Amino acid sequence: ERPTFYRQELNKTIWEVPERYQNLSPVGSGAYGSVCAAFDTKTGHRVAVKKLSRPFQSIIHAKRTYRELRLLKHMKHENVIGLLDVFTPARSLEEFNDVYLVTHLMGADLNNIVKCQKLTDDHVQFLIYQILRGLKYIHSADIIHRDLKPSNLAVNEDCELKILDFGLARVATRWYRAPEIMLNWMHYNQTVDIWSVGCIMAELLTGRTLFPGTDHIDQLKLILRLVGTPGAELLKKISSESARNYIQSLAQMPKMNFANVFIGANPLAVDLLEKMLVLDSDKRITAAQALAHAYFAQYHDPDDEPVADPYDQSFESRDLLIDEWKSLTYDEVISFVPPPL
Numbered sequence: 001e002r003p004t005f006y007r008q009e010l011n012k013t014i015w016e017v018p019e020r021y022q023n024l025s026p027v028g029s030g031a032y033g034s035v036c037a038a039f040d041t042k043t044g045h046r047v048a049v050k051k052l053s054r055p056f057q058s059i060i061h062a063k064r065t066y067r068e069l070r071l072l073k074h075m076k077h078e079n080v081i082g083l084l085d086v087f088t089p090a091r092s093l094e095e096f097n098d099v100y101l102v103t104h105l106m107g108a109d110l111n112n113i114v115k116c117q118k119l120t121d122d123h124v125q126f127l128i129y130q131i132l133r134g135l136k137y138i139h140s141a142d143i144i145h146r147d148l149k150p151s152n153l154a155v156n157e158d159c160e161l162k163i164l165d166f167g168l169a170r171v172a173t174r175w176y177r178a179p180e181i182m183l184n185w186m187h188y189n190q191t192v193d194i195w196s197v198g199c200i201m202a203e204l205l206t207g208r209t210l211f212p213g214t215d216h217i218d219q220l221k222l223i224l225r226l227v228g229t230p231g232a233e234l235l236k237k238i239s240s241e242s243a244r245n246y247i248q249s250l251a252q253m254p255k256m257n258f259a260n261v262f263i264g265a266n267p268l269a270v271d272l273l274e275k276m277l278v279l280d281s282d283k284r285i286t287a288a289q290a291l292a293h294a295y296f297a298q299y300h301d302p303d304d305e306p307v308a309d310p311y312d313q314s315f316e317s318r319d320l321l322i323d324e325w326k327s328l329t330y331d332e333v334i335s336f337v338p339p340p341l
């Protein structure tokens with residue numbers, strides 16, 4: 001019918017959950033939002049429970065709440081975070097004011113893993129393979145992550161990887177961002193995420209941030225030093241006059257030979273980096289193409305790299321009232337079907 005809930009105070013936060021979830025312990029020191037590790041008495045498994053912060057306080061909060069629930073309810077893939085449960089203590093739409101989301105509990109984020117040292121080439125093959133397998137899935141539904149960086153990627157002891165998003169909650173996004181979506185200078189596609197994967201892979205191999213810019217101007221200067229200033233062919237496709245003026249006003253840099261930058265790395269790794277870190281977003285490798293690159297010979301299976309069901313994002317166009325976004329969210333909580341045990 002409906003379970004029995006119990007109340008708690010944790011880090012100045014109130015928490016009201018079903019008895020099924022036990023021994024709630026705050027994790028991530030703010031960086032994941034309001035999240036507790038919990039023990040799930042139904043499965044005998046550890047889980048993560050997130051309490052959304054002020055979910056219906058404004059129109060923009062209410063839309064963000066709907067968007068996060070809709071994305072989580074869609075994701076059914078080994079390398080993307082998925083929804084085990086969603087609950088509110090509210091018995092009706094009228095008193096609906098709190099949303100709790102339940103996922104798998106992961107062992108570590110990749111930020112607090114590179115921080116020690118660099119990884120073996122074999123560890124890098126396996127981790128980048130799993131990122132690209134999750135991205136083929138997300139991109140097949142016309143979903144773009146847009147903020148891939150080591151702090152949004154999580155792994156277990158056995159090195160199984162999942163893509164998450166910790167949104168706004170306290171490693172600069174700037175350092176991993178595609179030049180075209182940073183300065184909005186060209187048509188942008190799913191391959192903004194492939195630029196980010198290139199930056200992350202470089203960092204796992206060298207143990208150093210590839211492009212540690214201090215701001216957007218410093219960031220572009222560090223990038224152009226490796227990949228070279230745009231040619232006349234890429235200049236032809238820049239719609240922004242101010243962008244085009246800025247670029248053409250710098251003194252010309254050549255493309256460096258990546259074999260001279262990533263010295264001693266697997267030459268198959270250097271070749272894949274050349275294909276990911278191209279300025280022209282029409283010429284960057286896709287996730288599906290990257291999975292068939294020789295670098296992943298050990299892992300690639302074309303019969304086990306699935307696509308996603310279609311995702312209706314027509315809501316993204318709509319301008320509705322708080323109470324409308326709230327009712328739509330309540331509907332999705334009510335209609336939720338747990339994954340098969």
Ligand SMILES: Cc1ccc(C(=O)N[C@@H](CCC2CCCCC2)C(N)=O)cc1NC(=O)c1cnn(-c2ccccc2C)c1
Nearest residue numbers: 032048050068071101103105106107108154163164165167
């Ligand atoms: C409970 C929960 C709820 C929401 C999210 C989450 O990723 N939400 C996304 C969903 C959509 C996004 C679209 C692009 C593809 C990726 C997904 C968002 N911002 O909308 C994560 C967890 N879980 C965690 O925060 C979590 C799970 N173990 N840990 C953890 C716990 C201890 C140590 C290390 C880690 C990583 C943290």
